[PDB]
């Protein structure tokens, strides 16, 4: 079943996951948008 799903593409292979994790770690470092900041500042103070 895992082989069939990996042929399908709903699950990707472990070595390919490792190489993709390395690629995303070296290439991408996202920033939060300013419109994404006030929601965290509200959803963090409501817990407190």
């Amino acid at each position: 079943m895992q082989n069939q799903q990996e042929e399908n593409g709903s699950e990707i292979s472990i070595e390919k996951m490792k190489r993709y994790i390395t690629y995303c770690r070296l290439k991408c470092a996202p920033r939060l948008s300013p419109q994404a900041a006030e929601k965290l500042s509200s959803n963090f103070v409501t817990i407190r």
């Binding site: 895992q2 082989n3 990996e6 472990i14």
Partner: protein, 96 residues
């Protein structure tokens, strides 16, 4: 081997052949037979691994002949290594 394994009572005969110097401990001998024969270790699709050998713990009051069972397994198994915790004249379990 095929001729003797074709017999219906091969498993009970193997269990009875376990440790002839040991008397009356059929359950221990059965566990020893499972540990000596072992199962199938399986690595499915590389990611998930399942152990395929039986680990047996003989917890007993002293004088119940656990040591003689261990020496029988040592004489019987292909690669059996004896180790002890309290004693010193043995191969250590820690790598060094």
């Amino acid at each position: 081997f095929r001729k003797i394994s074709r017999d219906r009572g091969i498993i009970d005969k193997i269990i009875s052949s376990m440790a002839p110097s040991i008397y009356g401990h059929r359950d221990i001998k059965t566990a020893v037979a499972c540990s000596l024969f072992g199962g199938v270790p399986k690595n499915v699709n590389g990611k998930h691994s399942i152990r395929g050998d039986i680990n047996v713990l003989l917890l007993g009051d002293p004088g119940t002949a656990k040591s003689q069972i261990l020496k029988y397994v040592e004489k019987t198994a292909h690669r059996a290594v004896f180790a002890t915790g309290q004693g010193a004249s043995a191969v250590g379990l820690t790598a060094s």
